[PDB]
Amino acid sequence: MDGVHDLAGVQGFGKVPHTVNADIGPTFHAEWEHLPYSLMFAGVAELGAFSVDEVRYVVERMEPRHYMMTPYYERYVIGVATLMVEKGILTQDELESLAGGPFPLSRPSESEGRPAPVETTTFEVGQRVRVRDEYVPGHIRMPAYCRGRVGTISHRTTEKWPFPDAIGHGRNDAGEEPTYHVKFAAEELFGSDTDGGSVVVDLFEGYLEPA
Amino acid sequence: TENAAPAQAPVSDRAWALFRALDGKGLVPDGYVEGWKKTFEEDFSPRRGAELVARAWTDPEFRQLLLTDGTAAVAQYGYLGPQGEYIVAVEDTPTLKNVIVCSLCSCTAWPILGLPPTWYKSFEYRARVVREPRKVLSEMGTEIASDIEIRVYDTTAETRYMVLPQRPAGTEGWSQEQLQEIVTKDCLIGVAIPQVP
Ligand SMILES: [Fe+3]
Ligand SMILES: [Mg+2]
């Protein structure tokens, strides 16, 4: 999904609000902040109602201006609540009654997702690969800066996982694929307009093709 | 107004409403969220990654395991966990500085780095460090010379990373505890270099 959440490479932001080893304060800075992760794991591990990938996608589905003005942990309150309503476990009515006020949720998905691709290749370390020039309106774990670009394999994982573009939609056809550490030169991703050296993206097999 | 925020109840009230809606239906086991809060606050910690770095710095055999099968190395300490089940450690060298981000959200090796800090989840870091990591680190207080390659790892799938920083001069002969003390959270994320007094 080419949403505002795909922020790498966006220009115009100011300083990162940190200097090295500065005080970051407690793990939680308000008494509710442990609830989004905790209730995510209840949903995943206790209710079996959704996957972690579906949490990433529902946060991607926040209305874009809503995403941009909402603090991190509140985005996950909104996302987990949205999933609980979408999966039939809760209603928005009861959430607003308990909350005492409006509780707008993420927007409905505009894609049913897609299966794990049928034809892929097992790549070896050192091989050159290109990121498939594909547009996916639902969930995908490919930041757009690497779409269509060429890099080299640094690592093939020794484990496999369900394809995000399927399991992020709760589909039954996510299969399993390894992922690859793909090293891109900074100039391949941003031309002259970078001060970096290389960028390594961890890309599912189904996002890649031989160069 | 145009582009105005939607009306919303205070976030605390929304978050506790989500809790009560689920707990009222018997879907949240007793002590379940309190259990997680304690795990997040007390067990997941950058002191674990510091311990791993200090071990690597004084034990070449472990250093080699950590760099080739980070999962196995971490498991020897019992530090695998949620968002830290497949670990890859990346080593800094005299010509290479590694830095980690999740540009798409906040993915972090929770059990050995701790939950990410607010700044790591900021739009500023997420947007900028992939494209201008040298300038970002400089602004953050870390100068990386022109002759050093910077390599940014974007945590886009299930690999969870930790940086193995270079061991600084002036620590020869230190004990593992002494070494652990100068490996901070920011060292493990890669935006800081360990400092010697
Ligand atoms: Fe993330
Ligand atoms: Mg975009």
mmCIF file of C-alpha atoms and ligand atoms in Angstrom:
data_model
loop_
_atom_site.group_PDB
_atom_site.id
_atom_site.type_symbol
_atom_site.label_atom_id
_atom_site.label_comp_id
_atom_site.label_asym_id
_atom_site.label_seq_id
_atom_site.Cartn_x
_atom_site.Cartn_y
_atom_site.Cartn_z
ATOM 1 C CA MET A 1 0.000 0.000 0.000
ATOM 2 C CA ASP A 2 1.589 3.296 -1.104
ATOM 3 C CA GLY A 3 0.409 5.032 2.075
ATOM 4 C CA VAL A 4 1.904 7.895 4.015
ATOM 5 C CA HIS A 5 3.393 5.342 6.396
ATOM 6 C CA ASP A 6 6.028 4.538 3.733
ATOM 7 C CA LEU A 7 8.220 7.376 4.949
ATOM 8 C CA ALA A 8 11.767 6.416 4.009
ATOM 9 C CA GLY A 9 13.220 8.994 1.645
ATOM 10 C CA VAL A 10 10.561 11.651 2.340
ATOM 11 C CA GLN A 11 12.169 15.106 2.480
ATOM 12 C CA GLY A 12 11.189 18.073 4.690
ATOM 13 C CA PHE A 13 11.375 16.633 8.198
ATOM 14 C CA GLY A 14 13.469 18.311 10.860
ATOM 15 C CA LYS A 15 15.856 16.963 13.496
ATOM 16 C CA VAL A 16 15.384 13.606 15.115
ATOM 17 C CA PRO A 17 14.278 14.423 18.661
ATOM 18 C CA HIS A 18 17.234 12.786 20.371
ATOM 19 C CA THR A 19 20.937 13.117 20.977
ATOM 20 C CA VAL A 20 22.983 10.034 21.779
ATOM 21 C CA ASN A 21 22.454 8.481 25.189
ATOM 22 C CA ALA A 22 20.010 11.161 26.236
ATOM 23 C CA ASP A 23 17.350 10.240 28.818
ATOM 24 C CA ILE A 24 14.415 8.603 27.038
ATOM 25 C CA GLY A 25 12.351 8.306 30.211
ATOM 26 C CA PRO A 26 10.438 5.216 31.312
ATOM 27 C CA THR A 27 9.324 2.508 28.927
ATOM 28 C CA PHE A 28 5.750 3.807 29.180
ATOM 29 C CA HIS A 29 5.079 7.515 29.513
ATOM 30 C CA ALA A 30 1.392 7.185 30.351
ATOM 31 C CA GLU A 31 -0.576 4.634 32.323
ATOM 32 C CA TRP A 32 -2.434 3.310 29.248
ATOM 33 C CA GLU A 33 0.521 2.873 26.934
ATOM 34 C CA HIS A 34 1.126 -0.833 27.600
ATOM 35 C CA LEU A 35 -2.402 -1.673 26.476
ATOM 36 C CA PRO A 36 -2.036 -1.598 22.654
ATOM 37 C CA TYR A 37 0.810 -4.173 22.564
ATOM 38 C CA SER A 38 -0.724 -6.214 25.350
ATOM 39 C CA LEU A 39 -4.144 -6.362 23.685
ATOM 40 C CA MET A 40 -2.484 -7.055 20.324
ATOM 41 C CA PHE A 41 -0.936 -10.198 21.845
ATOM 42 C CA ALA A 42 -4.259 -11.130 23.414
ATOM 43 C CA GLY A 43 -5.794 -10.906 19.961
ATOM 44 C CA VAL A 44 -2.987 -12.895 18.321
ATOM 45 C CA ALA A 45 -2.103 -15.502 20.898
ATOM 46 C CA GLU A 46 -5.197 -15.852 23.105
ATOM 47 C CA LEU A 47 -8.173 -15.066 20.847
ATOM 48 C CA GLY A 48 -6.490 -16.246 17.601
ATOM 49 C CA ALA A 49 -8.431 -13.418 15.938
ATOM 50 C CA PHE A 50 -5.733 -11.798 13.784
ATOM 51 C CA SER A 51 -2.004 -11.905 12.911
ATOM 52 C CA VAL A 52 0.718 -9.377 13.702
ATOM 53 C CA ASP A 53 0.792 -8.570 9.989
ATOM 54 C CA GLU A 54 -2.916 -7.611 10.143
ATOM 55 C CA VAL A 55 -1.962 -5.163 12.914
ATOM 56 C CA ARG A 56 0.678 -3.507 10.710
ATOM 57 C CA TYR A 57 -1.819 -3.257 7.859
ATOM 58 C CA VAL A 58 -4.710 -1.836 9.932
ATOM 59 C CA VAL A 59 -2.337 0.919 11.154
ATOM 60 C CA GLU A 60 -1.400 1.543 7.497
ATOM 61 C CA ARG A 61 -5.147 1.905 6.888
ATOM 62 C CA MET A 62 -5.580 4.897 9.184
ATOM 63 C CA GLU A 63 -6.887 7.844 7.221
ATOM 64 C CA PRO A 64 -3.652 9.569 6.130
ATOM 65 C CA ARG A 65 -4.050 12.865 7.981
ATOM 66 C CA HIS A 66 -5.153 10.867 11.035
ATOM 67 C CA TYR A 67 -1.980 8.778 10.826
ATOM 68 C CA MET A 68 0.187 11.889 10.589
ATOM 69 C CA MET A 69 -1.178 13.604 13.702
ATOM 70 C CA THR A 70 -1.473 10.498 15.938
ATOM 71 C CA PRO A 71 1.223 9.473 18.458
ATOM 72 C CA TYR A 72 2.720 5.982 17.956
ATOM 73 C CA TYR A 73 1.022 4.031 20.750
ATOM 74 C CA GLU A 74 -2.345 5.645 20.016
ATOM 75 C CA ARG A 75 -2.119 4.397 16.412
ATOM 76 C CA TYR A 76 -2.011 0.858 17.846
ATOM 77 C CA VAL A 77 -4.996 1.515 20.139
ATOM 78 C CA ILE A 78 -6.899 2.589 17.065
ATOM 79 C CA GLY A 79 -5.600 -0.371 15.014
ATOM 80 C CA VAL A 80 -6.299 -3.103 17.502
ATOM 81 C CA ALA A 81 -9.741 -1.652 18.227
ATOM 82 C CA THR A 82 -10.418 -1.588 14.449
ATOM 83 C CA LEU A 83 -9.461 -5.222 14.071
ATOM 84 C CA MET A 84 -11.623 -6.225 17.011
ATOM 85 C CA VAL A 85 -14.610 -4.542 15.316
ATOM 86 C CA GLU A 86 -13.792 -5.928 11.882
ATOM 87 C CA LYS A 87 -13.454 -9.474 13.215
ATOM 88 C CA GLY A 88 -16.854 -9.289 14.917
ATOM 89 C CA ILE A 89 -15.526 -9.368 18.497
ATOM 90 C CA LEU A 90 -16.498 -5.809 19.450
ATOM 91 C CA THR A 91 -18.750 -3.079 18.082
ATOM 92 C CA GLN A 92 -17.851 0.537 17.539
ATOM 93 C CA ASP A 93 -20.975 1.439 19.487
ATOM 94 C CA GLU A 94 -19.801 -0.283 22.613
ATOM 95 C CA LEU A 95 -16.323 1.203 22.310
ATOM 96 C CA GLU A 96 -17.763 4.717 22.034
ATOM 97 C CA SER A 97 -20.140 4.157 24.958
ATOM 98 C CA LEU A 98 -17.335 2.939 27.169
ATOM 99 C CA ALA A 99 -15.018 5.685 25.992
ATOM 100 C CA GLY A 100 -17.645 8.349 26.523
ATOM 101 C CA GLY A 101 -17.093 9.836 23.094
ATOM 102 C CA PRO A 102 -15.924 9.362 19.513
ATOM 103 C CA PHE A 103 -13.569 6.543 18.630
ATOM 104 C CA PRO A 104 -12.903 6.772 14.890
ATOM 105 C CA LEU A 105 -11.181 3.700 13.470
ATOM 106 C CA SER A 106 -8.950 2.894 10.531
ATOM 107 C CA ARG A 107 -10.571 2.908 7.084
ATOM 108 C CA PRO A 108 -11.817 -0.283 5.460
ATOM 109 C CA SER A 109 -9.374 -2.186 3.336
ATOM 110 C CA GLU A 110 -9.558 -1.538 -0.379
ATOM 111 C CA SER A 111 -7.789 -4.774 -1.245
ATOM 112 C CA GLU A 112 -8.443 -8.445 -0.538
ATOM 113 C CA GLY A 113 -4.632 -8.988 -0.490
ATOM 114 C CA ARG A 114 -2.797 -11.471 -2.709
ATOM 115 C CA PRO A 115 -1.457 -15.009 -2.378
ATOM 116 C CA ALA A 116 2.147 -16.060 -1.899
ATOM 117 C CA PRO A 117 3.451 -15.992 -5.475
ATOM 118 C CA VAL A 118 3.555 -19.346 -7.222
ATOM 119 C CA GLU A 119 6.749 -18.808 -9.178
ATOM 120 C CA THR A 120 9.786 -17.613 -7.247
ATOM 121 C CA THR A 121 13.506 -18.352 -7.157
ATOM 122 C CA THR A 122 15.852 -19.484 -4.357
ATOM 123 C CA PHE A 123 18.698 -16.939 -4.464
ATOM 124 C CA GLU A 124 22.270 -17.423 -3.229
ATOM 125 C CA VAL A 125 24.516 -15.024 -1.348
ATOM 126 C CA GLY A 126 26.320 -12.772 -3.837
ATOM 127 C CA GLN A 127 23.652 -12.997 -6.518
ATOM 128 C CA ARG A 128 22.260 -9.808 -8.078
ATOM 129 C CA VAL A 129 18.499 -9.373 -7.799
ATOM 130 C CA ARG A 130 15.922 -6.782 -8.773
ATOM 131 C CA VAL A 131 12.880 -5.855 -6.728
ATOM 132 C CA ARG A 132 9.806 -6.761 -8.741
ATOM 133 C CA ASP A 133 8.255 -3.713 -10.372
ATOM 134 C CA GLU A 134 4.806 -4.382 -8.895
ATOM 135 C CA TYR A 135 2.178 -2.208 -7.227
ATOM 136 C CA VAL A 136 0.217 -3.776 -4.361
ATOM 137 C CA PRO A 137 -2.726 -1.782 -2.903
ATOM 138 C CA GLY A 138 -3.001 -3.985 0.209
ATOM 139 C CA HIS A 139 -0.264 -4.886 2.678
ATOM 140 C CA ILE A 140 3.298 -5.346 1.461
ATOM 141 C CA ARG A 141 6.660 -5.269 3.304
ATOM 142 C CA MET A 142 8.517 -3.564 0.477
ATOM 143 C CA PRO A 143 9.241 0.189 1.046
ATOM 144 C CA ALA A 144 8.749 1.965 -2.231
ATOM 145 C CA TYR A 145 12.304 3.321 -2.382
ATOM 146 C CA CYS A 146 13.510 -0.130 -3.444
ATOM 147 C CA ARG A 147 10.802 -1.001 -6.004
ATOM 148 C CA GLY A 148 12.412 -1.911 -9.318
ATOM 149 C CA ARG A 149 15.962 -1.372 -7.944
ATOM 150 C CA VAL A 150 18.885 -3.814 -8.105
ATOM 151 C CA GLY A 151 20.979 -5.040 -5.169
ATOM 152 C CA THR A 152 23.022 -8.032 -4.001
ATOM 153 C CA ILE A 153 22.056 -10.824 -1.631
ATOM 154 C CA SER A 154 23.908 -10.704 1.714
ATOM 155 C CA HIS A 155 21.846 -13.403 3.458
ATOM 156 C CA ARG A 156 19.032 -15.880 2.881
ATOM 157 C CA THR A 157 17.164 -16.654 6.096
ATOM 158 C CA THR A 158 17.269 -20.185 7.417
ATOM 159 C CA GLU A 159 13.594 -19.880 8.487
ATOM 160 C CA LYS A 160 10.476 -19.152 6.447
ATOM 161 C CA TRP A 161 7.400 -17.066 7.152
ATOM 162 C CA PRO A 162 3.947 -16.475 5.677
ATOM 163 C CA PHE A 163 3.856 -13.915 2.868
ATOM 164 C CA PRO A 164 2.776 -10.619 4.393
ATOM 165 C CA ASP A 165 0.612 -9.605 1.457
ATOM 166 C CA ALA A 166 -1.642 -12.568 2.282
ATOM 167 C CA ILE A 167 -1.446 -13.023 6.030
ATOM 168 C CA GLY A 168 -1.755 -9.262 6.507
ATOM 169 C CA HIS A 169 -5.276 -9.744 5.096
ATOM 170 C CA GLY A 170 -6.037 -12.889 7.081
ATOM 171 C CA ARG A 171 -5.895 -15.074 3.916
ATOM 172 C CA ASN A 172 -5.428 -18.856 3.879
ATOM 173 C CA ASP A 173 -2.863 -18.829 1.083
ATOM 174 C CA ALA A 174 0.169 -17.099 2.629
ATOM 175 C CA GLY A 175 2.380 -20.169 2.275
ATOM 176 C CA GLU A 176 5.889 -19.649 3.529
ATOM 177 C CA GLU A 177 8.957 -17.988 2.086
ATOM 178 C CA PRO A 178 12.442 -17.122 3.331
ATOM 179 C CA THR A 179 13.561 -13.524 3.225
ATOM 180 C CA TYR A 180 16.731 -12.029 1.837
ATOM 181 C CA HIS A 181 19.000 -9.277 3.084
ATOM 182 C CA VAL A 182 19.366 -7.273 -0.117
ATOM 183 C CA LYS A 183 22.150 -4.690 -0.135
ATOM 184 C CA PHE A 184 21.565 -1.638 -2.309
ATOM 185 C CA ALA A 185 24.124 1.095 -2.986
ATOM 186 C CA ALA A 186 22.803 4.427 -1.702
ATOM 187 C CA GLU A 187 23.150 5.915 -5.239
ATOM 188 C CA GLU A 188 20.912 3.146 -6.614
ATOM 189 C CA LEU A 189 18.061 4.280 -4.345
ATOM 190 C CA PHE A 190 18.541 8.064 -4.213
ATOM 191 C CA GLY A 191 21.019 9.019 -6.990
ATOM 192 C CA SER A 192 23.310 11.870 -5.867
ATOM 193 C CA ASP A 193 20.844 12.944 -3.189
ATOM 194 C CA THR A 194 22.091 10.844 -0.250
ATOM 195 C CA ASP A 195 25.096 10.944 2.108
ATOM 196 C CA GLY A 196 25.002 7.231 2.856
ATOM 197 C CA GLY A 197 26.823 4.160 1.617
ATOM 198 C CA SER A 198 24.499 1.179 1.461
ATOM 199 C CA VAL A 199 21.032 0.202 2.578
ATOM 200 C CA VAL A 200 20.031 -3.425 3.361
ATOM 201 C CA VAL A 201 16.339 -4.230 3.025
ATOM 202 C CA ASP A 202 14.940 -7.579 4.299
ATOM 203 C CA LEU A 203 12.808 -8.684 1.388
ATOM 204 C CA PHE A 204 10.505 -11.690 0.990
ATOM 205 C CA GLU A 205 11.410 -14.054 -1.841
ATOM 206 C CA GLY A 206 8.183 -13.185 -3.659
ATOM 207 C CA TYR A 207 9.278 -9.542 -3.994
ATOM 208 C CA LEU A 208 12.429 -10.427 -5.968
ATOM 209 C CA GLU A 209 13.545 -11.585 -9.452
ATOM 210 C CA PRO A 210 16.947 -12.274 -10.993
ATOM 211 C CA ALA A 211 18.711 -9.130 -12.129
ATOM 212 C CA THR B 1 -12.198 22.654 8.603
ATOM 213 C CA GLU B 2 -10.273 21.333 5.689
ATOM 214 C CA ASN B 3 -7.657 18.783 6.835
ATOM 215 C CA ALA B 4 -8.885 19.099 10.454
ATOM 216 C CA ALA B 5 -8.536 16.276 12.968
ATOM 217 C CA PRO B 6 -11.543 14.037 13.610
ATOM 218 C CA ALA B 7 -13.309 14.417 16.941
ATOM 219 C CA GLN B 8 -11.977 11.864 19.441
ATOM 220 C CA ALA B 9 -12.440 11.065 23.115
ATOM 221 C CA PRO B 10 -9.237 11.437 25.230
ATOM 222 C CA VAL B 11 -6.829 8.665 24.271
ATOM 223 C CA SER B 12 -6.672 7.281 27.832
ATOM 224 C CA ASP B 13 -10.442 6.855 27.761
ATOM 225 C CA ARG B 14 -10.315 5.086 24.386
ATOM 226 C CA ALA B 15 -7.464 2.780 25.426
ATOM 227 C CA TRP B 16 -9.141 1.743 28.688
ATOM 228 C CA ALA B 17 -12.456 1.340 26.820
ATOM 229 C CA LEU B 18 -10.784 -1.160 24.503
ATOM 230 C CA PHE B 19 -9.487 -2.992 27.560
ATOM 231 C CA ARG B 20 -12.864 -3.019 29.321
ATOM 232 C CA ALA B 21 -14.796 -4.057 26.228
ATOM 233 C CA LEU B 22 -12.603 -7.152 25.845
ATOM 234 C CA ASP B 23 -12.106 -7.907 29.543
ATOM 235 C CA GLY B 24 -15.838 -7.628 30.192
ATOM 236 C CA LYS B 25 -16.393 -10.450 27.763
ATOM 237 C CA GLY B 26 -13.911 -12.745 29.429
ATOM 238 C CA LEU B 27 -11.416 -12.466 26.578
ATOM 239 C CA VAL B 28 -8.482 -11.200 28.633
ATOM 240 C CA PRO B 29 -7.009 -13.685 31.132
ATOM 241 C CA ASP B 30 -6.448 -12.580 34.699
ATOM 242 C CA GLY B 31 -3.306 -10.458 35.068
ATOM 243 C CA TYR B 32 -2.671 -10.715 31.314
ATOM 244 C CA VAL B 33 -1.947 -7.080 30.419
ATOM 245 C CA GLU B 34 -0.165 -6.519 33.770
ATOM 246 C CA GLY B 35 2.024 -9.515 32.885
ATOM 247 C CA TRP B 36 2.994 -7.989 29.571
ATOM 248 C CA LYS B 37 3.619 -4.565 31.135
ATOM 249 C CA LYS B 38 6.126 -6.219 33.505
ATOM 250 C CA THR B 39 7.829 -8.116 30.655
ATOM 251 C CA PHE B 40 8.098 -4.939 28.602
ATOM 252 C CA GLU B 41 9.415 -2.903 31.553
ATOM 253 C CA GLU B 42 11.697 -5.351 33.265
ATOM 254 C CA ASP B 43 12.733 -8.262 31.076
ATOM 255 C CA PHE B 44 13.145 -6.740 27.633
ATOM 256 C CA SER B 45 16.279 -4.608 28.077
ATOM 257 C CA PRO B 46 19.346 -3.190 26.300
ATOM 258 C CA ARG B 47 21.368 -4.492 29.243
ATOM 259 C CA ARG B 48 20.976 -7.946 27.563
ATOM 260 C CA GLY B 49 22.428 -6.786 24.255
ATOM 261 C CA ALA B 50 25.240 -5.069 26.224
ATOM 262 C CA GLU B 51 26.026 -8.403 27.864
ATOM 263 C CA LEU B 52 26.138 -10.027 24.449
ATOM 264 C CA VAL B 53 28.501 -7.346 23.115
ATOM 265 C CA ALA B 54 30.844 -7.598 26.088
ATOM 266 C CA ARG B 55 30.948 -11.390 25.676
ATOM 267 C CA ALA B 56 31.719 -11.077 21.986
ATOM 268 C CA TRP B 57 34.439 -8.531 22.752
ATOM 269 C CA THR B 58 36.248 -10.963 25.069
ATOM 270 C CA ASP B 59 35.498 -14.347 23.490
ATOM 271 C CA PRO B 60 36.356 -14.774 19.787
ATOM 272 C CA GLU B 61 34.439 -18.037 19.599
ATOM 273 C CA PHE B 62 31.227 -16.469 20.813
ATOM 274 C CA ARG B 63 31.846 -13.399 18.587
ATOM 275 C CA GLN B 64 31.928 -15.760 15.595
ATOM 276 C CA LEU B 65 28.697 -17.530 16.663
ATOM 277 C CA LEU B 66 26.921 -14.192 17.230
ATOM 278 C CA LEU B 67 27.912 -12.986 13.725
ATOM 279 C CA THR B 68 26.950 -16.203 11.899
ATOM 280 C CA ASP B 69 23.976 -17.498 13.912
ATOM 281 C CA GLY B 70 22.833 -14.690 16.170
ATOM 282 C CA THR B 71 19.710 -16.611 17.156
ATOM 283 C CA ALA B 72 21.757 -19.484 18.516
ATOM 284 C CA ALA B 73 24.108 -17.136 20.363
ATOM 285 C CA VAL B 74 21.261 -15.232 21.977
ATOM 286 C CA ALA B 75 19.521 -18.472 22.928
ATOM 287 C CA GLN B 76 22.558 -19.518 24.989
ATOM 288 C CA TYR B 77 21.691 -16.611 27.275
ATOM 289 C CA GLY B 78 17.943 -17.359 27.148
ATOM 290 C CA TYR B 79 17.217 -13.993 25.534
ATOM 291 C CA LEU B 80 15.065 -15.037 22.533
ATOM 292 C CA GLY B 81 11.512 -13.675 22.799
ATOM 293 C CA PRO B 82 8.712 -11.788 21.059
ATOM 294 C CA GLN B 83 10.066 -9.603 18.220
ATOM 295 C CA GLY B 84 13.441 -11.286 18.729
ATOM 296 C CA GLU B 85 13.141 -14.889 17.476
ATOM 297 C CA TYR B 86 15.451 -14.578 14.433
ATOM 298 C CA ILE B 87 18.498 -12.455 15.336
ATOM 299 C CA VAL B 88 21.232 -11.099 13.096
ATOM 300 C CA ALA B 89 24.117 -9.176 14.604
ATOM 301 C CA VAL B 90 25.969 -6.822 12.232
ATOM 302 C CA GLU B 91 29.541 -5.914 12.910
ATOM 303 C CA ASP B 92 31.056 -2.471 12.716
ATOM 304 C CA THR B 93 34.629 -2.360 11.353
ATOM 305 C CA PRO B 94 37.207 0.438 10.814
ATOM 306 C CA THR B 95 35.584 1.076 7.454
ATOM 307 C CA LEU B 96 31.931 0.284 8.175
ATOM 308 C CA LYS B 97 29.281 1.713 10.543
ATOM 309 C CA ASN B 98 25.901 -0.093 10.806
ATOM 310 C CA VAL B 99 22.639 1.556 11.822
ATOM 311 C CA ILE B 100 19.161 0.040 12.272
ATOM 312 C CA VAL B 101 15.688 1.441 11.582
ATOM 313 C CA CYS B 102 12.173 0.348 10.775
ATOM 314 C CA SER B 103 11.088 2.888 8.169
ATOM 315 C CA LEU B 104 7.617 1.337 7.861
ATOM 316 C CA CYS B 105 6.778 1.311 11.616
ATOM 317 C CA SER B 106 9.068 0.476 14.592
ATOM 318 C CA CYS B 107 10.425 -3.064 14.305
ATOM 319 C CA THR B 108 13.137 -3.648 16.886
ATOM 320 C CA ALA B 109 14.812 -6.647 18.575
ATOM 321 C CA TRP B 110 12.742 -6.077 21.722
ATOM 322 C CA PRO B 111 14.186 -8.692 24.088
ATOM 323 C CA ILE B 112 17.812 -7.568 23.739
ATOM 324 C CA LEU B 113 17.441 -3.866 22.852
ATOM 325 C CA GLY B 114 14.296 -3.062 24.858
ATOM 326 C CA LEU B 115 11.144 -1.608 23.280
ATOM 327 C CA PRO B 116 12.119 1.150 20.860
ATOM 328 C CA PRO B 117 12.427 4.686 22.153
ATOM 329 C CA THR B 118 10.086 7.451 21.017
ATOM 330 C CA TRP B 119 12.719 8.942 18.791
ATOM 331 C CA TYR B 120 13.315 5.722 16.836
ATOM 332 C CA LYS B 121 9.598 5.594 16.038
ATOM 333 C CA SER B 122 9.547 9.264 14.991
ATOM 334 C CA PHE B 123 8.695 10.252 11.468
ATOM 335 C CA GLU B 124 11.951 12.202 11.399
ATOM 336 C CA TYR B 125 14.111 9.110 11.977
ATOM 337 C CA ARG B 126 11.950 6.859 9.790
ATOM 338 C CA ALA B 127 12.112 9.244 6.880
ATOM 339 C CA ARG B 128 15.624 10.523 7.130
ATOM 340 C CA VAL B 129 18.107 7.933 8.320
ATOM 341 C CA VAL B 130 17.712 5.683 5.223
ATOM 342 C CA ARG B 131 18.622 8.617 2.922
ATOM 343 C CA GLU B 132 21.007 10.778 4.989
ATOM 344 C CA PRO B 133 22.290 8.657 7.831
ATOM 345 C CA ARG B 134 25.571 10.584 8.074
ATOM 346 C CA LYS B 135 23.747 13.878 8.718
ATOM 347 C CA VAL B 136 21.276 12.259 11.083
ATOM 348 C CA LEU B 137 24.006 10.652 13.178
ATOM 349 C CA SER B 138 25.939 13.928 13.174
ATOM 350 C CA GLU B 139 22.914 15.834 14.473
ATOM 351 C CA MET B 140 22.477 13.120 17.090
ATOM 352 C CA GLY B 141 26.045 13.641 18.309
ATOM 353 C CA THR B 142 27.960 10.970 16.354
ATOM 354 C CA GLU B 143 30.458 12.002 13.690
ATOM 355 C CA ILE B 144 31.250 9.335 11.101
ATOM 356 C CA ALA B 145 34.228 10.127 8.877
ATOM 357 C CA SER B 146 33.996 10.300 5.116
ATOM 358 C CA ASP B 147 36.159 7.165 4.796
ATOM 359 C CA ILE B 148 33.670 4.972 6.658
ATOM 360 C CA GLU B 149 30.804 3.355 4.751
ATOM 361 C CA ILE B 150 27.480 3.757 6.565
ATOM 362 C CA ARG B 151 25.118 0.815 6.106
ATOM 363 C CA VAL B 152 21.473 1.213 7.119
ATOM 364 C CA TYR B 153 19.477 -1.922 7.883
ATOM 365 C CA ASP B 154 15.742 -1.373 7.334
ATOM 366 C CA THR B 155 13.852 -3.909 9.471
ATOM 367 C CA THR B 156 11.137 -4.787 6.934
ATOM 368 C CA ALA B 157 10.505 -8.468 7.718
ATOM 369 C CA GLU B 158 11.247 -10.839 10.597
ATOM 370 C CA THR B 159 15.028 -10.515 10.976
ATOM 371 C CA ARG B 160 15.644 -8.511 14.166
ATOM 372 C CA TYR B 161 18.989 -6.801 14.332
ATOM 373 C CA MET B 162 21.604 -5.681 16.795
ATOM 374 C CA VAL B 163 24.789 -3.770 16.075
ATOM 375 C CA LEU B 164 28.091 -5.147 17.364
ATOM 376 C CA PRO B 165 30.083 -1.916 17.769
ATOM 377 C CA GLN B 166 33.846 -1.780 17.600
ATOM 378 C CA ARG B 167 35.604 -2.215 20.908
ATOM 379 C CA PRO B 168 37.133 1.159 21.758
ATOM 380 C CA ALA B 169 40.731 1.680 22.627
ATOM 381 C CA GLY B 170 41.548 2.142 26.281
ATOM 382 C CA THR B 171 39.453 -0.822 27.428
ATOM 383 C CA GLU B 172 42.218 -3.414 27.245
ATOM 384 C CA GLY B 173 41.893 -5.905 30.071
ATOM 385 C CA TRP B 174 38.490 -4.687 31.226
ATOM 386 C CA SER B 175 36.110 -7.211 32.720
ATOM 387 C CA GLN B 176 32.833 -8.162 31.041
ATOM 388 C CA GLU B 177 30.971 -5.983 33.573
ATOM 389 C CA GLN B 178 33.134 -2.962 32.856
ATOM 390 C CA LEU B 179 32.654 -3.430 29.133
ATOM 391 C CA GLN B 180 28.899 -3.937 29.446
ATOM 392 C CA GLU B 181 28.554 -0.577 31.159
ATOM 393 C CA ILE B 182 29.679 1.405 28.110
ATOM 394 C CA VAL B 183 27.502 -0.446 25.573
ATOM 395 C CA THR B 184 24.242 1.545 25.635
ATOM 396 C CA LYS B 185 20.886 1.134 23.878
ATOM 397 C CA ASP B 186 21.975 3.655 21.233
ATOM 398 C CA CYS B 187 25.129 1.622 20.604
ATOM 399 C CA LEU B 188 23.020 -1.438 19.908
ATOM 400 C CA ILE B 189 20.732 0.508 17.532
ATOM 401 C CA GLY B 190 23.904 1.890 15.881
ATOM 402 C CA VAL B 191 23.498 5.646 16.314
ATOM 403 C CA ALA B 192 26.156 5.877 19.062
ATOM 404 C CA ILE B 193 29.688 4.548 19.507
ATOM 405 C CA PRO B 194 30.683 3.233 22.948
ATOM 406 C CA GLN B 195 32.471 5.900 24.991
ATOM 407 C CA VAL B 196 35.432 5.412 27.299
ATOM 408 C CA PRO B 197 35.899 7.801 30.270
HETATM 409 FE FE FE C 1 8.365 -1.622 12.692
HETATM 410 MG MG MG C 2 5.064 6.494 -1.323
#
